[PDB]
From TrEMBL:
Belongs to the universal ribosomal protein uL2 family. It comes from Nicotiana tabacum. PROSITE patterns: RIBOSOMAL_L2. This is 60S ribosomal protein L8-like. Residues 1-25 are annotated as: Disordered. Residues 10-89 form the Large ribosomal subunit protein uL2 RNA-binding domain.
Length: 245
RNA sequence: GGACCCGAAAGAUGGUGAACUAUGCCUGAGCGGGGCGAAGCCAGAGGAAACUCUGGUGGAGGCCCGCAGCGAUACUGACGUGCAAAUCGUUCGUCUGACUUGGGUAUAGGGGCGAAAGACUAAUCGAACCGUCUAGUAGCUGGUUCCCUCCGAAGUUUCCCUCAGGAUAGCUGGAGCUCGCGUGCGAGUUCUAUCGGGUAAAGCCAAUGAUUAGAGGCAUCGGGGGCGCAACGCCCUCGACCUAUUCUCAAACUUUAAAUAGGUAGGACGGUGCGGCUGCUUUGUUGAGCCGCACCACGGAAUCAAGAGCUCCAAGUGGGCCAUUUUUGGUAAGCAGAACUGGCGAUGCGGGAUGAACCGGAAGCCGGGUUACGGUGCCAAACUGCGCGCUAACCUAGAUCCC
RNA sequence: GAACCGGGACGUGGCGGUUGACGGCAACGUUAGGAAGUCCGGAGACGUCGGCGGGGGCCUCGGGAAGAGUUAUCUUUUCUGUUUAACAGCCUGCCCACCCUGGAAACGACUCAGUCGGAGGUAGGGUCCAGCGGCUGGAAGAGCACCGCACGUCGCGUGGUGUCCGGUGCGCCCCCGGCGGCCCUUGAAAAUCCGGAGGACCGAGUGCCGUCCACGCCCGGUCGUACUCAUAACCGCAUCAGGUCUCCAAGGUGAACAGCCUCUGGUCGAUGGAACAAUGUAGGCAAGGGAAGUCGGCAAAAUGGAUCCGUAACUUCGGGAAAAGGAUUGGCUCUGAGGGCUGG
RNA sequence: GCCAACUCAGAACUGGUACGGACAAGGGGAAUCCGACUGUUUAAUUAAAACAAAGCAUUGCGAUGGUCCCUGCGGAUGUUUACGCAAUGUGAUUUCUGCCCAGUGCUCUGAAUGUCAAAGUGAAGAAAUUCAACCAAGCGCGGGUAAACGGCGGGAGUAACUAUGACUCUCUUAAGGUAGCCAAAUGCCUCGUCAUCUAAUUAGUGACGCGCAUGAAUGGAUUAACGAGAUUCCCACUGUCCCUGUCUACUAUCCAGCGAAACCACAGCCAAGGGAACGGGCUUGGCAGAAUCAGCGGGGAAAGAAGACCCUGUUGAGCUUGACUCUAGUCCGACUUUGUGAAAUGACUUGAGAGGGUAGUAUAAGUGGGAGCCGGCGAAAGUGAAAUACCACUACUUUUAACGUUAUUUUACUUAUUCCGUGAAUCGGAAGCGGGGCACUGCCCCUCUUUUUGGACCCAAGGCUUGCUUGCAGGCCGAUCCGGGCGGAAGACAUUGUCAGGUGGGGAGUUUGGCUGGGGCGGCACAUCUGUUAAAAGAUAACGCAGGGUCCUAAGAUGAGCUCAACGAGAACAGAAAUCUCGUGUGGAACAGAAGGGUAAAAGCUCGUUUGAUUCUGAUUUCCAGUACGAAUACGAACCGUGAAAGCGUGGCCUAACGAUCCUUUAGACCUUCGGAAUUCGAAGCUAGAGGUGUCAGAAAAGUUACCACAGGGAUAACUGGCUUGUGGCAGCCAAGCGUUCAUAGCGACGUUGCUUUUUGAUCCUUCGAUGUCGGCUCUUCCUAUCAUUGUGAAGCAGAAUUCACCAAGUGUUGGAUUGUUCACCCACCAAUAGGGAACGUGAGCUGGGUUUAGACCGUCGUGAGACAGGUUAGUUUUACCCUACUGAUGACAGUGUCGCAAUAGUAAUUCAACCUAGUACGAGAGGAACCGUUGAUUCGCACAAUUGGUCAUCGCGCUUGG
């Protein structure tokens, strides 16, 4: 008869993201004439740590195409990039790690990161540390490029979508064991109030379908309907299978 | 309808709280002295080499003892109308981190928040607090205010999600009305005459069923012994069978069959003789009812009759209990359940020492007389009255229905 | 009494015109020493822990002088105080950072720990940075201590002496510097201020144009400000043994803001008196036995600091571990070892 | 030479061996269980094994998305992007994680139309409307899934002693407990069996295992280190105890001052009696003497609270789901938003064409004339059930356009709509400057200027041309022209809105009968019949006794004929039992069913004819209120059956076999109404049946609560008390037998009479506005049904020992292991280690180990919430100052004092050992007493401190730490 924790998540106010010390969103430059037709050069000034994000970020300074001022950008760092490096963004940019190129100019089998979904969206795919997308094939008839995403899915995107050459830096982070609750506490303190987690079978019936019983047990199948209403949809949602492979 | 008065656990609606506590966020602050001695580094020794070893340096850890801080294990200590609606004393856990803490800020009631105890959300939490709907509804508990006088119950029937309730009939009050004065439309009573019964008892030597014992007979058709190869051959024992007897039995057996109790009748609403009506009935004014006229009818058994009949409105009651006799279950019960009557309940009074039911007896306020039951050695009113026997208790002799 | 900040306006003097200073090889220095739209950088501006070093205050030892305490005996001894603010100038120049000469293995330099060097070490010579560093002015005239004269009811009167010279440190509080450890944690923003890139535009010859320089002049609103901050000034119905954030922090013992005693400061506020029955509450002891008590060793007792010797099974090899088990500990009189500065 | 600090290590000397001198400050060891550890938690009874945790595993999701919030609009995750976010389970490391997809879930690019709404389409009708096809998701079917919920049994045969079963086959239901582990925090029996630990062990440890009911991420096994966690043992230690004593402070005490509260019908001495079954009051007795002080915990069934346990109410509430009825969300179809075009494919139109036999070649598929048809067939018959010849139309399978209908797909456009990016900064076309080839003057093919470097980059130089002569100012190129789309993506799909179907404990509301020797479980005594209880009219109770929702066109109606069961005697197979003959035959047969009645030319059996099992209403009986229903009975008014007729028949031979209102539906009338008038559909009326309420005078209805609540109930359970005494315990009587013979020394079978309330039952009288619920500890008293001790009788009593019995309750009846234990069982001592009451004595006397709140684990059960007579661990014990009682203390008792008497009340002593008797009596031996006397001792009681021991704040003396 009580709202469950998963339900309470949506209202927020204690489950909102912790973003006080973050350095702003990481994204490509806004797509413009220079990147569409030629190439534009910037310089990497700093490599910084973004709290709550495994991958390091890169500060890049560009010369504004048509204004007398500096254009400052924050890119998701690719492995191998260093301070003082020159980054080239555009259709005519060379195929080097750290450069941002339109997928139409990236040959097949290339490893890229921060791939745009819609032309000009400034990058939404393969942004986490150690992750990357792979260019599979091109279709000039409809101007569409096929990519393999980190999850293994194959997606078709417009060939004008941009992507940075190389993989995201910081790979191998999840290999290290944490060994203690304090490390997880520190990890999630800068992410959100999602830790520690209380098991449903440890609660009373009033606040969870798994609660109750003189023994600790679910008492009914943990697989639930895809259309099960909020508050009832707990456990393995719409599972096509369970158990070991 | 507030509905005689007071009372629920709840439900609904609209508002108020994160000054406590829970969690996230922002910005500040706080945490002796010791122990162990990880990486990294320096030097030396052994060895053919590989490599091994030793002594220093350094200071890691959700590491250890421990002060402050934070918390609260045991005494199940103190106190337990306390210093205190959670405190005090000793003891105890942790103490550089998942650490402690101030202020600001966010989350508000079927909502929040929860390292999860249904915990916390202002001494309020398995749904906060404040006002209102609201005099919420209660077959349930408690109260329900002057006097005398008259009458005066019920715990039983049927129906009800009915079993602590209600309606219904019965019991009761009030109002009367119709008549009547012994010629009485009557009666919890007898008498006379007529009917029904299957209990008590009795019966099995009567049907059905149960059951003991012997006696006399019988078989080409029972088990054995003897005489025998067998024999429908012979002699005996026990069994069946027949006959006449015999012990003992029945709520769901019975021929017979009480006591008590049940029904009907004993005139004025009768009888007799004529005539009439019918569409009913008959072969038949043959019957069956009914209707007119004439005559007779001493009231047609006893006793009593503080009279008989009729109607309307309505209260309370619908938990009963006890006793002689009859009687079911139960070892029995101050157990549980039925029949008739009476009693207590609703009722005092004398007796049984004492007592709701036993015995007596029922009652306005008094004087006198006499009794009922029970008593007359004292307590305590009335004889140590007149008489006959029994008992002698070295066990507390014995001493009055229920008891 | 002596300073500072912000704002306003001018006057005097100074500074530049090679229109927009000079010096240094350089780091950079000097009180001044153009400039508009536009653009760029820095400060503000940041976690935590450990060692080391510097500064201020405190603590502490010795000497000089002033006063006081003790003095049956000893005590050149015991006690108190012996001060220097903001601000201005000059000097100095921690640890770092930076610059010039030069070119290094037989490698050297170097910290407690690290670390650094042909991407230029050692060495020689310099620049800059901090300071809560030094001297001077402020400022001895002030404050403090001591010794005198005077009114002796009301002179907040009047005068003198001193305020000096050294040592020491794993000491305590605060600030700072520079390294190192930790993170799947990397530990605010803005107002505001400073600097820089560019040079449109701008002036004269005995006066003009500028000037962040020196001195002089004027002004600076509104509200809070007492007191308590707690065993009686807040909350708990109270003058309630509870609860309520934080700053300062002496001496002795001792590892120690442990316990105990003491100095400054505070305080004797818990209604008082008499007696010392039982039963209680709190705190001890108890011959012999030693858990037989009790559901149960509940409670209490025992052990305990430091130094030396020594330490098993098991083990995730990190521990177990202070395992277990033994010895010592006072006072007094000595001995030895462990340092700094100066001088060829 | 001048200064400087406290660290370390040694050596003498020395004190009453004192010296971390106060203070400060681990007890240790050997094991088992749980949880890895650090951390967190029920503020005010539970700190834990519970929660979290790192590690492990599973699930969804690529943004047009997953999860979630929101009335709506829009939002959180998201300053994000799979090394991520979201939803779960397990719980370090090590090792392992077996079989089962039948069930419930979840899931799928699977077959298919078995079912499937609204809208839309077609037929009929005057229309309302009814019929058909088409028909989404979902459901059904199929597949996959167990680190999803969960499950892991039984049977038969089989090895050469037996036993088991490697092996083979089978059933429910998919499989049949694998590796492991165990009387476990998990085992009932159970205190299981064995070993060990102890003197003794329901405890601990190890082992065994058909294990009521162990078992593998509902995780199994182990595990160093850790723990205010649960357990066992050992060492040290001790006032826990033997067994108490003593010391200090503060109280209590007394005083000055000050000064409440709880509670109070009236009050307060007892024994018994009865009584509402436990009185302070009543009855009968005992007694009983002013006024006061300090305690005390027996009583006041003391106070504290309208019992929280249990039951009842037509009272809730938290939670759950396979309960009833709904609902947010979600999926799906239609219409709308919604505009502009082109093609395929499947049906329906018509239109031409091909095919078929169960047995036979064959359309003989179906039909008519065929005797005649266009050389060909019948005209003959082989199958035959029905003819081939010439005509079509009828059914089934099968191709394709002229016209038209319908449905599903593919695809085109962008302006509606939706989404993305930007400070809407170069978008579309063309042309020029340059670079390539061709062959010859034109073509086509490409580019927009920036890639060794951690620099800077803006506000136009230049050329041409005007005002007039420039303070300077105005135009073009530099800087191509033209496009009145900021740049893209999806796109009439998505999205909004309205209806329609599915899903929907996420959420709302509600329900979850009654009787009942408490309630539940059980049963139905709830409608209802027979016999009996039932007491010879009727009526009559119990969860008394023994039993009983249909069936029949005949098993109803009528007429006729006959007589059944059984027995006796006879007849081949044939007999106990087949069919047949005669005789007897009162029903001993049959009549649907339970039982009781009833019936013989019948009510039974056979046969003939039949539908009175018919229509119409009234009356009566049974039940009973003299209501209804059911059932039955006697007439009346009709039509019939049967019989010759009287007559009989209104269902079953009689006594049971059944059902209101509302609604639905059927039958009846030339019936009534639709209210402005007519006709016709439709609807509504009247009369009689049918669909049913079995809780049967008739709601529509699942659990749980230990998180719990309210109104009440002693109308009703869980103690004591009261009745009873079956059961338990303790006695008696008779005498068949036992006892070498002998019933009775000692016993007592078969029977039979009693007593007791320390057993357990039975009951429900008292108590539910509360009488504190086990056991132990302490303390007193009482009983005898006597264990020991004193005195006796009897013996199958030689002695010793033992047994039976009589006076007898004066005295005593113990220390320990295991268990919470009562109980039990062992060890030990002893004269003995008897049995019991006192509200199952005794909690304002204690304790709190157990039972019996809330936390938590295991096993079994349940889908679940949760349950458990199963186990386990942690879990607040309140108040006396009132009256009485009792213990002591003043006082009263007629001046004061001393010495005394004395009723009455209380009372106290107990048991054992040794020596001698005595190796005596007795006895064949073995063995083996007792009186007297002497010396000690046990338990208990009253005193006392010479000695010993204890006690210190003599604060007495000494020593000593820090200040
Ligand atoms: K809710
Ligand atoms: K959290
Ligand atoms: K968890
Ligand atoms: K559950
Ligand atoms: K579980
Ligand atoms: K009324
Ligand atoms: K607050
Ligand atoms: K904070
Ligand atoms: K609420
Ligand atoms: K009632
Ligand atoms: K008879
Ligand atoms: K008979
Ligand atoms: K009534
Ligand atoms: K800050
Ligand atoms: K640091
Ligand atoms: K200042
Ligand atoms: K400038
Ligand atoms: K002030
Ligand atoms: K203050
Ligand atoms: K013990
Ligand atoms: K025990
Ligand atoms: K810790
Ligand atoms: K812990
Ligand atoms: K704890
Ligand atoms: K846990
Ligand atoms: K989303
Ligand atoms: K799981
Ligand atoms: K399955
Ligand atoms: K399945
Ligand atoms: K199976
Ligand atoms: K495991
Ligand atoms: K613990
Ligand atoms: K007083
Ligand atoms: K008496
Ligand atoms: K009720
Ligand atoms: K509740
Ligand atoms: K659409
Ligand atoms: K729906
Ligand atoms: K639901
Ligand atoms: K009939
Ligand atoms: K009923
Ligand atoms: K419920
Ligand atoms: K008995
Ligand atoms: K009772
Ligand atoms: K009670
Ligand atoms: K005991
Ligand atoms: K505890
Ligand atoms: K005298
Ligand atoms: K005496
Ligand atoms: K003495
Ligand atoms: K003494
Ligand atoms: Mg579990
Ligand atoms: Mg707050
Ligand atoms: Mg500790
Ligand atoms: Mg009534
Ligand atoms: Mg009778
Ligand atoms: Mg009488
Ligand atoms: Mg009289
Ligand atoms: Mg540290
Ligand atoms: Mg010092
Ligand atoms: Mg001076
Ligand atoms: Mg400049
Ligand atoms: Mg207040
Ligand atoms: Mg020291
Ligand atoms: Mg919306
Ligand atoms: Mg479908
Ligand atoms: Mg096995
Ligand atoms: Mg285990
Ligand atoms: Mg009595
Ligand atoms: Mg109550
Ligand atoms: Mg009722
Ligand atoms: Mg006949
Ligand atoms: Mg009906
Ligand atoms: Mg004899
Ligand atoms: Mg006796
Ligand atoms: Mg006795
Ligand atoms: Mg289960
Ligand atoms: Mg006496």
């Amino acid at each position: 008869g009580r709202v469950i924790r998963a339900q309470r998540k949506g209202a927020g106010s204690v489950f909102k993201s912790h973003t006080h010390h973050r350095k702003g969103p990481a994204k490509f430059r806004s797509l413009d004439y220079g990147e569409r037709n030629g190439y534009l050069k910037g310089v990497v000034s700093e490599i910084i740590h973004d709290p709550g994000r495994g991958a390091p970020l890169a500060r890049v300074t560009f010369r504004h195409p048509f204004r007398y001022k500096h254009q400052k950008e924050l890119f998701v760092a690719a492995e191998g990039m260093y301070t003082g490096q020159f980054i080239y963004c555009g259709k005519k940019a060379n195929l080097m790690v750290g450069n941002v190129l339109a997928l139409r100019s990236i040959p097949e089998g290339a490893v890229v990161c921060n791939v745009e979904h819609k032309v000009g969206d400034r990058g939404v795919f393969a942004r986490c540390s150690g992750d990357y997308a792979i260019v599979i094939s091109h279709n000039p008839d409809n101007g569409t490029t096929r990519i393999k995403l980190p999850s293994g899915a194959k997606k078709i995107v417009p060939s004008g979508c941009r992507a940075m050459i190389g993989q995201v830096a910081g790979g191998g982070r999840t290999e290290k064991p944490m060994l203690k609750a304090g490390n997880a506490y520190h990890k999630y303190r800068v992410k959100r109030n999602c830790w520690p987690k209380v098991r449903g079978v440890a609660m009373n019936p009033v606040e969870h379908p798994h609660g109750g019983g003189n023994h600790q047990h679910i008492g009914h199948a943990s697989t639930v309907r895809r259309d099960a209403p909020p508050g009832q949809k707990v456990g393995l949602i719409a599972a096509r299978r369970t158990g070991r492979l």
